[PDB]
């Protein structure tokens, strides 16, 4: 059944085996008396071994067990178990096989764990498998160079909370600014910005630009004044504007305003 | 915030944070612009507001501590209102494009379409009534493509004006674009409210403001809702959210096409150049630990043509067990002549006996004829050296492969209510978190 | 003492429609209704006071294994719990979700419903409150309605009903998708101000005389508004509905396992022929024809993701050593390629309502001239030409000296591609492409030197031409009209390597692209006919122009033999680029009426460096 | 946790029996629910 | 800053600091798959936990090639 | 100075004073930095005659950083001593000979950050760490493959401020390593 | 599918750590004797060829999501005299290790939990007669599964378990063709005290007390090709929770599960057999089987198959097995792999089974 009685199987690689114990305290007086200290057994292994080798000159055995990776696809294991070229069977291989087939209509898989057999009667070569798929099928298409990615917004499906117009001059005056772009018609040029958002993380450090915390009073109607085409009540929060305004309609945003 | 938490414009005046503000955070901002030879101020800065803290005394017994508060411009508020100016200073008109980095031109392309059911590229007037008569240049409706309607169409690839646009969206890194973050912002600051609603304006009559006298042709286009109110509170309004912002963006950074894996199987890629297999040697090469495409052929790089790379990738955590099983008969009639006649069963194990809608599982069949015929023609060889200045031996050969293959689909028994084939579109269990 | 055994917020992923559903009221933010919507689960609410939870007939619970155990899943059921007031006669009550669903492969959609009075409460009776389900693209204008009247559930005595008869199959909803698809024919010719149509502008073929039969379902009644698509339902809403005249109805409904059964496996077909010959090294030719059928795909790809059209394609690549046709003492390298190739794809089904197969709306159309413009908008028809001349140049001889003036330093490449595309968009669109390049590139080999090292200089005529004409999906006797792009550029860099001396290394370059833009009239309106082979060899106006010089100097101070020691390196790399504006600056055109140009961009650099030694020893 | 398991000082049994006071497992709060093995069995109700 | 899941047992998200190359982090969380799958890009790395349950969470961090495993704690 | 700009009010007005009465400057900035870093303050590596090899090195840190947005310093100091031990014990019998390997590795990091007002005295205790530690490994080799390590590694962490807490870590045992 | 599956506490005492007999369908109790026999029938330590030996044998879980979560197990055997062997063995189950931290500093103190799970048993064989040995082994189970948060304890909790088994194995008995020979097991596994994750007298689950009876058949064909063909059956002997009810409504399910609760062990043990409206026919489905087959080439190569059976109406895990093993020089490597063949997901499914055992010391003769 096989061809000789040698078993020379070389195995290689390390084992470790790790085994200890692990106290931790954590002075949190917020938990039970019974959370005083955690004493457990830490034990692990990393056996990171590879095994090769021929049996009887009819098996060849390859597989590699390293328990530090992802094991989908780089824990093998192969059997290959090929009788004389005069016998029925052909091959008989177990493990990690594979099934490529030449045909564009129909695809095999080449990541396979199971049973792959192989059988040859006189012309006719019947291959078997029987397995389970350890890989998924992907397709890209790509157009002058890279990957092509589509994208299906909708109209609701807008960037929110995340840009604001600095004021209400500002954002009526986007519309008629970009009547005619890419020429801008407008000679606004903002050189300074500061910005300030509600301060939950109350970190400290010189790294991340200095430490700079303010008293922060933010009004609404600061720096407006009104607009050609819309009702003060839709630029103003406040209640009354008489004798609120103090510059011409149509004035650019200011603090005078 | 930092100078890399946000952007802005500095010419129409907006900022874009790095981080969404969808809770109560407070957003406040002091700026200086320039108008030509003025300068202008709306907050108070580190710099030129008052001093953070007064101190009056000498000991900690007689001293008073007095802490001054800048004061700023507030641009989100604390409590969410939308029937207030603050809420309008956020952009409604800035759409992200999912998972964008560096969108090129030339390499972008945006289209809007109105879904109703279908794509289409343009817009009906209601039955029983039509489109405003007349329209300037700029406001044409009807028959008019949707990029020309929303203003987002109106000059050519360099960028120069152009009569009815080039058909293709308007790529201008400063206002209709954001490069660095992937983001389309329209030219309008609401285009599917105020732009689309002066467009089928029929009289003065009507004012965006008041929904109660729209003619009817606002009543189906003008989506104010989303303008007007929270996108959870847009929800409710169902019937406006048909426009479709449809388009594809190429990422290539690198030299060959990323797979989108690593260490991908030897021989598990399959490239198709134009409904035709290219050879693994030939046309093209593969770098399977990067996970990289690179197409020698020198007549399909310069081709435009859109390549199709499929490839079994194994770096897959989640996916159910797949049982693949089946054999191939590859009988040889000759010794140029093969048939082969695959058969194949790929299966799938639900993680449970229930299968929501899109983990669906797949019981599926398919099973083959091919046939292969290689051989020399000498004919062809002879041709060839009847040509002026050809005298070569290499033999000419000719190749058929032929193939049908049929797909028997089905789902797998275990994922069976009542012995039928059963699609979960809702079993009620995922809500009330 | 309260102890909370649990204390939570609990948010729901079905939104109460906060609107009106009938079309009288017109303000549902009335009439006090407490329209609560609610989960009921098997964990919790085993032991209800109405009516105990329980699973419906056939439904098991999940079963998972998390650590070497067997944990049985929850199982829930959404709760809509209408008090207060009641319903009116015709308001209705919803909850809804936005969705993306694709029920076209499956041919029956099921519910479980349930129906009880509420406690303390007058009793609800059988055949008043009516359960309906509501799907398709928003549910004001375009929907599917499934209404069925409820049987409620019998109480008073214990608490805990068998499930048969909780979920009583009589309420269980069972909906056959081609049932929709006629009604949806049938509506095709209901006038949108038809009396068929109700108040709410919905059509029940119940309650239309002209119709016999009804909507083919006994125990449903089913409505359609505005040619909804349930080949993707984006919008799905369940609710309650009110059938007594003067009552006004309280009681709760629970919704359970919404599915789709009834999958169609019927299979595909698909077929490759590739014919590949090769000729003595001189000719080759690789024809590829594929033609599959409806349902065909792959093992791994789902219900949704297989085939639902025809395809039809071929594909014929011929490549040519022209080169070979003339002598090898002076080797000429001349390939040419020629791949031509057309797919046509007719769908399964049609391209409008999205939902009703291509056949079954053609067969119900009697009309000649509406069937032949639905079968022509629905194929998809695409056909790509590419000629190939890439890589022209003249072969070294084995022993032959290298010259500036040589014609072997020269390359040419040409490329034409061409794609006629037209589908369900695009009534005919054309794209194509010239790409003419030839480049330069010698290298020399052996008061100051002034003979360069090496000299680069390569040109490119890029020309593309896209015609887009989209379609009238109404009637294919007018169409839109075609827009045009056009890119014809003419691009040219060069370059040179000085060393003028054993230190010194002065490299230039210099980049420009140009525009033609001859294509256009005296405004801003471009031709129709133009050709893009029209006026080929044009250099435009320039577009863009970027200069780089490089210079390296190693400073030879140690000639002086006092400073020997010093190992000064200079670098100085200077950049230049000019951009030309667009044409809404050059030709801006004030509100006065002036025109003003705003001229162009000029960017300069420098990038300065010295790098010294200065080693103090010697 | 430390009153039902390891009973402190000057608490007796009829303390931590009074319905007030008594520790609630999951098998009575939720008698359907399946918990696995050697996870949390115990409710941690908040006592007002 | 190599890569980091800041809050580990928490009642709130997960700020996940790692490097440029975006992320498609997921959860299944104690006994099967359950994935949330989010999008996490280089500068707004915030998921969303706060509302599922609370249990021991597995999570898959997917920097393109840098596929980092590990357990969150939802409290 | 990470970022300084030209104020746009120092100009030819007659208007020169702000609203705190200081004039106006012609360069406004809003942090200052001043970081001072000894690695390392010193390193006494030697190694003896007796194969008993010594690495201590002590390093030291300061990050001042000034803002005048409030007007405040904040300032973060660091400390950082290091030693590492490593000896050959010669010959060592369990019948079976071989060298054992000693490897120490203490370390003990303070860190502090504290924010000073000027006007008066306000230091504040913004943040702080203060963990040490002790890594001990002695590797034997029972054999040509199979080695023994025996590990123990102690970390503790105070608490600077109260939002965090002590945190005591001990790690112990052995490691048998087997190679074919 | 499953209805009212019996609750017992530490269940991974119940999953096979080794590869060789999860290769042969998670039954060892009548196979060969064999260096991981603790788990399954420690009588056969006795009939060990070789002095002394150590495994270590590595069965991971989740693999696809996380590479943490594992079996680990430890054994070693020596046998003193050709009469008695003394037995260590040492399950751990663990998660790996949380890293929880609250902060975003790359260098503040970080707290590690690894809730983990941990069998360590000995036991001692006597071969009492020339073909039948007995063993008695003594387990200490201990449980860390939890993450100590505010109001809430994770003290791990403890207990005992006694195992008392059985081994038989016959002479070299020759056939017409070929010399076979029978071996015969029987395991009584996980006696002790009910162990109480909540550290509460009155919350307490049972210990998975187990009873396999297994018997097998060596086909010797040349001395060095070996056919064992195993059949084992497993029962557990904890009393089953009822079902709808043995008398409002939820009164009387109350009623029966406080009935089952209040039961101890060594009542339940008799009590197991029954407890139930069915027939004695209908009691016979509680139990499990395994049948496997073993081929031994030159004795450094096997091959092993084997199926396991659970009932349809508790436990539902019904799988194959492959099996591989193989011996270099004194060190056998057995890989082990899993086809599952039951509706519920099973946690080993595309999971290679990993086993490392080395031998030395005299080599004993084998009667
Ligand atoms: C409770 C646990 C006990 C654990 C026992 C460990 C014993 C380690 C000794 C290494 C060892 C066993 C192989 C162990 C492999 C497991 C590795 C683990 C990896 C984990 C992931 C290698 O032995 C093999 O390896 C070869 C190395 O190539 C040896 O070659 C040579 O090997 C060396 C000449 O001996 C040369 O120095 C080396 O130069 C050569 O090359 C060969 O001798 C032999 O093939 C030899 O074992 C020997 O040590 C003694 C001790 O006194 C043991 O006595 C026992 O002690 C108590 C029990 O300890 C018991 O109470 C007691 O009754 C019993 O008398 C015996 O066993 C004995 O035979």
Redesign the pocket.
């Known amino acids: 059944i096989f061809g000789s009685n040698t078993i020379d199987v070389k195995p290689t690689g390390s084992?470790?085996?790790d085994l200890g114990v692990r106290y931790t305290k954590q002075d949190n007086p917020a938990f039970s008396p019974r959370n005083r200290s955690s004493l457990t057994f830490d034990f692990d292994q990393r056996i990171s071994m590879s095994l090769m080798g021929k049996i009887g000159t009819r098996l060849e055995v390859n597989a590699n067990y390293d328990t530090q990776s992802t094991f989908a696809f780089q824990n093998l294991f192969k059997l290959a178990y090929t009788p004389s070229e005069d016998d029925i069977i052909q091959k008989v291989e177990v493990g990690n096989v594979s099934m490529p087939l030449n045909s564009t209509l129909i695809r095999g898989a080449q990541s396979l764990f199971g049973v792959k057999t192989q059988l040859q009667f006189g012309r006719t070569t019947i291959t078997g498998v029987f397995s389970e798929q350890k890989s998924q099928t992907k397709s890209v298409v790509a157009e002058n160079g890279g990957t092509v990615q589509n994208f299906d917004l909708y109209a609701l499906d807008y960037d929110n909370d995340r840009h604001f117009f600095l004021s209400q001059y500002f954002r009526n005056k986007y519309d008629v600014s970009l009547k005619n772009y890419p020429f801008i018609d407008s000679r606004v040029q903002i050189t300074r910005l500061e910005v300030w958002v509600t301060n939950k993380q109350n970190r400290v450090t010189t790294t991340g630009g200095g430490n700079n915390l303010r008293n922060i009073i933010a009004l609404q109607d600061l720096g407006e004044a009104q607009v050609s085409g819309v009702p003060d009540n839709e630029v103003v929060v406040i209640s009354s504007t008489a004798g609120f305004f103090n510059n011409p309609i149509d004035s650019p945003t200011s603090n005078t305003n | 915030l930092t100078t890399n938490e946000y952007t802005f414009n500095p010419q129409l005046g907006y900022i874009s944070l790095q981080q969404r503000l969808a809770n109560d955070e407070i957003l406040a901002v002091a700026f200086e612009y320039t108008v030509g030879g003025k300068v202008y101020q709306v907050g108070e800065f580190g710099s030129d507001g008052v001093d953070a803290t007064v101190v009056t005394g000498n000991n900690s017994s007689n001293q008073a501590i007095i802490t001054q508060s800048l004061v700023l411009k507030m641009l989100k508020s604390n409590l969410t209102n939308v029937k207030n100016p603050v809420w309008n200073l956020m952009m409604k008109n800035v759409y992200q494009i999912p998972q964008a980095y560096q969108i090129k031109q030339d390499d972008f392309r945006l289209n809007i379409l109105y879904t109703d059911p279908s794509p289409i590229n343009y817009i009906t007037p209601v039955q029983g009534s039509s489109f405003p008569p007349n329209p300037a240049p700029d406001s044409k409706v009807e028959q008019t493509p949707l990029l020309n309607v929303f203003n987002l169409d109106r000059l050519n690839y360099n960028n120069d004006p152009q009569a009815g646009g080039d058909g293709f969206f308007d790529y201008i890194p400063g206002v209709t674009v954001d490069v660095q973050n992937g983001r389309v912002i329209f030219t309008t600051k609401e285009p599917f409210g105020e732009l689309i609603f002066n467009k089928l304006q029929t009289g003065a009559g009507e004012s965006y403001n008041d929904p109660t006298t729209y003619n009817a042709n606002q009543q189906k286009y003008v989506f104010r809702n989303m303008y007007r109110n929270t996108q959870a509170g847009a929800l409710q309004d169902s019937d406006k959210n048909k426009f479709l912002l449809r388009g594809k963006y190429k990422s290539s950074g690198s030299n060959g096409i990323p797979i989108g894996a690593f260490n991908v199987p030897q021989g598990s890629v399959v490239v198709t150049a134009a409904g035709r297999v290219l050879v693994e040697g030939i046309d093209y090469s593969v770098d399977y630990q990067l996970g990289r495409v690179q197409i020698l052929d020198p007549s399909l790089q310069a081709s435009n043509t859109p390549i199709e790379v499929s490839l079994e990738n194994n770096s897959i955590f989640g996916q159910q067990t797949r049982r693949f099983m089946g054999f191939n008969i590859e009988h040889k009639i000759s010794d140029k002549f093969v048939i082969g006649g695959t058969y194949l069963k790929m299966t799938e194990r639900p993680f449970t006996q229930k299968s929501t809608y899109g983990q669906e599982s797949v019981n599926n069949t398919i099973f083959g004829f091919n046939g292969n015929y290689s051989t020399e023609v000498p004919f062809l060889t002879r041709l060839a050296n009847k040509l002026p200045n050809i005298d070569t031996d290499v033999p000419s050969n000719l190749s058929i492969r032929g193939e049908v293959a049929f797909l028997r689909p089905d789902a797998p028994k275990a994922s069976d209510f009542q012995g039928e084939a059963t699609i979960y579109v809702d079993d009620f269990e995922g809500s009330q978190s | 003492t309260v102890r909370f055994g649990a204390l939570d917020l609990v948010r729901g992923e079905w939104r109460r429609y906060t609107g009106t559903l009938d079309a009288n009221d017109q303000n549902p933010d009335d009439d006090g209704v407490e329209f609560d919507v609610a989960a009921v689960n098997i964990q919790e609410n085993g032991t209800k006071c109405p009516v105990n939870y329980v699973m419906p007939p056939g439904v098991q619970r999940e079963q998972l294994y998390n650590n070497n155990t067997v944990i049985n899943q929850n199982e829930q059921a959404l709760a809509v719990r209408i008090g207060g007031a009641g319903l009116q006669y015709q308001d209705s009550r919803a909850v809804f979700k936005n969705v993306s669903v694709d029920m076209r492969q499956y041919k029956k959609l099921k519910m479980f419903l349930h129906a009880e009075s509420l406690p303390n409460q007058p009793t609800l009776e059988d055949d008043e409150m009516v359960g309906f389900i509501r799907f398709g693209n928003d549910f004001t204008q375009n929907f599917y309605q499934v209404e069925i009247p409820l049987k409620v559930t019998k109480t008073g005595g214990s608490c805990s009903i068998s499930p048969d008869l909780v979920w009583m199959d009589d309420n269980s909803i069972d909906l056959a998708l081609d049932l929709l698809t006629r009604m949806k024919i049938k509506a095709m010719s209901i006038d949108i101000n038809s009396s068929k149509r109700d108040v709410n502008g919905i059509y029940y073929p119940d309650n239309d005389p002209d119709l016999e039969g009804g909507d083919g379902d006994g125990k449903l009644t089913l409505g359609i508004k505005g040619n909804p698509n349930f080949g993707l339902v984006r919008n799905l809403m369940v609710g309650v509905k009110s059938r007594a005249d003067h009552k006004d109805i309280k009681g709760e409904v629970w919704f359970n396992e919404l599915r789709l059964a009834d999958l169609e496996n019927k299979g595909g077909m698909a077929a490759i022929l590739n014919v590949d010959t090769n000729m003595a090294d001189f000719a080759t030719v690789s024809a590829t024809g594929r033609k599959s059928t409806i349902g065909f795909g792959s093992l791994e790809q789902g219900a949704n993701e297989r085939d639902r059209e025809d395809v039809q394609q071929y594909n014929i690549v011929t490549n040519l050593n022209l080169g070979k046709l003339l002598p090898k003492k002076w080797g000429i390298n001349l390939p040419f390629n020629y791949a031509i190739g057309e797919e046509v794809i007719t769908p399964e089904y049609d391209p409008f309502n999205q939902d009703i197969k291509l056949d079954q709306l053609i067969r119900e159309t009697t009309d000649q001239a509406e069937k032949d413009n639905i079968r022509t908008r629905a194929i998809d028809y695409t056909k790509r030409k590419s000629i190939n001349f890439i890589g022209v140049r003249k072969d070294r001889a084995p022993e032959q000296k290298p010259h500036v003036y040589d014609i072997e330093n020269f390359t040419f490449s040409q490329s034409y591609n061409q794609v006629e595309r037209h589908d369900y968009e695009v009534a005919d669109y054309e794209d194509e492409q010239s790409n003419s390049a030839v480049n330069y590139a010698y290298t020399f080999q052996p008061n100051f030197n002034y003979l360069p090292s090496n000299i680069s200089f390569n040109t490119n005529i890029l020309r593309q031409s896209n015609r887009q004409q989209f379609r009238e999906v109404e009637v294919e006797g007018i169409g839109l009209d075609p827009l045009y792009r056009r890119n014809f550029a003419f691009n040219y860099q060069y370059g040179f390597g000085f060393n003028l001396t054993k230190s010194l290394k002065l490299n230039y370059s210099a980049t420009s692209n140009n525009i033609v833009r001859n294509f256009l009239n005296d405004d801003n309106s471009p031709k129709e006919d133009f050709n893009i082979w029209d006026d080929y060899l044009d250099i435009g106006t320039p577009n863009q122009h970027a200069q780089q010089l490089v210079l390296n100097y190693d400073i030879p101070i140690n000639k002086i033999p006092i400073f020997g020691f010093v190992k000064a390196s200079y670098s100085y790399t200077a950049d230049y680029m000019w951009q030309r504006s667009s044409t809404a600056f050059s030709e801006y055109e004030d509100p006065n009426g002036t025109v003003y140009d705003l001229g162009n961009t000029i960017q300069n650099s420098n990038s300065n460096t010295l790098t010294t030694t200065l080693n103090m020893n010697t | 946790p430390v009153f039902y398991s390891s009973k402190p000082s000057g608490i007796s049994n009829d303390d931590l029996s009074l319905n007030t006071t008594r520790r609630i497992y999951s098998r009575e709060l939720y008698p359907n629910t399946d918990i696995a093995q050697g996870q949390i069995q115990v409710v941690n109700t908040l006592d007002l | 800053s190599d890569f980091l899941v800041y809050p580990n047992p928490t009642k709130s998200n997960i700020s996940f600091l790692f490097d440029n190359e975006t992320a498609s982090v997921s959860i299944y969380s104690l006994l099967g798959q359950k994935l949330i799958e989010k999008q996490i890009t280089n500068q707004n790395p915030v998921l969303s936990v706060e509302g599922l349950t609370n249990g021991l969470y597995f999570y898959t961090f997917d920097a393109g090639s840098l596929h980092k495993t590990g357990k969150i704690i939802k409290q | 100075i990470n970022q300084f700009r030209s104020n746009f009010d120092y100009n030819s007005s007659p208007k020169v004073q702000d609203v705190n009465t200081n004039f106006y400057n012609e360069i406004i900035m809003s942090n200052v930095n001043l970081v001072e870093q000894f690695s390392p303050l010193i390193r006494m590596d030697f190694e003896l005659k007796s194969s008993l090899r010594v690495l201590s090195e002590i390093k030291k840190d300061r990050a001042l950083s000034m803002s005048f947005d409030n007007n405040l310093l904040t300032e973060v100091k660091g400390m950082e001593y290091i030693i590492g031990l490593g000896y050959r014990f010669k010959d060592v019998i369990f019948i079976?000979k071989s060298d054992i390997n000693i490897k120490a590795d203490f370390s003990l990091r303070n860190n502090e950050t504290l924010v000073r007002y000027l006007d008066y005295d306000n230091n504040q205790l913004a943040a702080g760490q203060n963990i040490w530690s002790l890594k001990l490994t002695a590797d034997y080799s029972?054999?040509?493959?199979?080695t023994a390590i025996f590990y123990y590694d102690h970390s503790f962490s105070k608490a600077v401020i109260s939002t965090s807490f002590p945190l005591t870590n001990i790690r112990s045992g052995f490691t048998?390593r087997?190679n074919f | 599918d499953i209805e009212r599956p019996i609750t017992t506490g530490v269940p991974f005492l119940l999953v096979a750590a080794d590869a060789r007999a999860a290769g042969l369908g998670d039954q060892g109790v009548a196979t060969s004797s064999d260096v991981f026999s603790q788990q399954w029938n420690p009588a056969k330590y006795a009939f060990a060829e070789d002095a002394?030996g150590?495994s270590?044998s590595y069965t991971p879980y989740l693999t696809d999501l996380a590479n943490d979560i594992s079996l680990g197990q430890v054994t070693?055997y020596?046998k003193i005299n050709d009469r008695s062997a003394f037995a260590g063995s040492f399950r751990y189950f663990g998660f790996g290790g949380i890293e929880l931290r609250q902060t975003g500093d790359p260098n503040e103190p970080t707290r590690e939990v690894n809730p983990n799970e941990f069998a360590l048993d000995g036991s001692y064989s006597l071969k009492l007669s020339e073909t039948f040995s007995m063993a008695v082994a003594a387990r200490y189970i201990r449980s860390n599964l939890k993450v100590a948060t505010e109001e809430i304890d994770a003290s791990a909790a403890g207990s005992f378990a006694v195992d008392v088994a059985g081994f038989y194995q016959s002479e070299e008995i020759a056939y017409s063709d070929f010399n076979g020979r029978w071996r015969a097991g029987f395991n009584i596994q996980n006696l002790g005290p009910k162990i109480s994750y909540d550290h509460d007298d009155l919350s307490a689950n049972f210990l998975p007390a187990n009873l396999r009876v297994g018997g097998g058949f060596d086909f010797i064909f040349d001395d060095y090709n070996k056919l064992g063909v195993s059949l084992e059956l497993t029962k557990l002997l904890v009393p089953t929770p009822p079902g709808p009810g043995t008398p409002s409504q939820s009164q009387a399910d109350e009623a029966n599960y406080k009935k089952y609760k209040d039961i101890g062990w060594v009542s339940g043990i008799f009590k197991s057999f029954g407890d139930a409206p069915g027939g004695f026919s209908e009691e016979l489905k509680e139990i499990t089987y395994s049948a496997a087959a073993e081929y031994m080439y030159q004795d450094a190569f096997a091959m092993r198959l084997g199926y396991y059976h659970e009932s349809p109406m508790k436990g539902a895990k019904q799988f194959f097995s492959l099996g591989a093993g193989f011996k270099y020089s004194?060190i056998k490597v057995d890989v082990s792999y899993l086809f599952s063949a039951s509706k519920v997901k099973n946690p080993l499914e595309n999971t290679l089974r990993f086993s490392l055992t080395?031998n030395?010391?005299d080599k004993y003769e084998t009667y």
């Open positions: 084992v470790e085996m | 079976i029972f054999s040509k493959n199979l048998l087997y | 002394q150590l270590i070693y020596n004194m080395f030395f010391g």
